[PDB]
Structures are given as C-alpha cells and as structure tokens.
Amino acid sequence: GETTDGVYRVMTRRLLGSTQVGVGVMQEGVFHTMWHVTKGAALRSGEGRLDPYWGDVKQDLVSYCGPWKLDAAWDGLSEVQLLAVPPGERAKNIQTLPGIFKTKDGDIGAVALDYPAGTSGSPILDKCGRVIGLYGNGVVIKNGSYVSAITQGKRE
C-alpha cells in the first residue's frame, strides 16, 4: 500500500473502536517502529501487507520490508524536535534540549516530554529533518514524570 516517506499511526481494531497503539517512520520503503507497539506482528497498509524483517526486544526496535535505514545520531549538544503523533490528535513538533541516560555501556540521549503510551514510535529529529531516534522507551523519574530514551538502531 502507501510507501511514501513520513510518519504514520499504528492502529488496531481488536479492542473497542479503532485504538492507536503507536507510531512509526516510513523511509526508503522500510517501516520503522518500536517492538512493544506491534510485538513483531504483520501490518496492513490498505490492501498491502508489511512483514517484519529485523527486530530486537532489548533495543525495543523493529523494521518492516527491509533492514533498519535510520542512522542519524544526536550530536550531544543541540536541541531536537519530537514529532509527537498523539492518539486522535494532529502531528505536532516540540523542541527540547535532550538530557542523558548514563548506563554501564555508555550514554544515550533522553527527551523529557510526557505523552500517551500510543505516542510510542514518534520520531525525534535534528535541524536537518533527519531521524536521530524514536520516542517511547524510558523511565518514571522521582517526580512521577516520564523521560524517554532517544532510541536509535544501527544501519547495516
């Protein structure tokens, strides 16, 4: 079906009404989303079918129709935009300066913007419009607010 580059809503008719479970990025004929949104299940695009190609529960990422294409990274210095696609609401760009998730295997960028669970998979972009990662996997901080990682894959 529709293979045009852009941001897309991931919907399901299994629950009550049409429920938005997540968001994804279409780039170079490849659909990119978080693993916890689809659980690796196939996707429909009108009458066309999208089958999974690569996935990893630890990274919490999955690609459809081909290998992971998104390879831009946060420069560790500048502000970014969360192109938030919330359930039932219009796509909206929000500008923030990312924080840091310090782990035992290195530092990861983090965005402190709180959005509904169905916003998971919304892309985070740099000043050139390049996708530097996806929003939707993070933690609940000492304040109760949500802080998501800037989750990026590896382009083989």
């Binding site: 919907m11 996707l43 429909r44 796509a91 840091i100 933690v139």
Partner: protein, 39 residues
C-alpha cells in the same frame, strides 16, 4: 490485526513550541528492554 495511516512529513519546524528539561539519570537496561533507575 494492525494497520498504518499517514500522519505527516518528517520536517524540522521553525518556531515550534520549546519545552522540556534535560535531566542526567543513572539508568539500567535489562534483557526485556525495560529501563530502570539506578540509585
């Protein structure tokens, strides 16, 4: 059964709403892909 619907272009927008702080957190990532706070 899941399906996709277009929601827009991936473009940087000049004069977008600027919000959100930049915290530095000590975190752990487990085998199930779940992040947790290390203290």
């Amino acid at each position: 059964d899941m399906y996709i619907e277009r929601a827009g272009d991936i473009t940087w927008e000049k004069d977008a709403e600027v919000t959100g702080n930049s915290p530095r957190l000590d975190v752990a990532l487990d085998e199930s892909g779940d992040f947790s706070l290390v203290e």
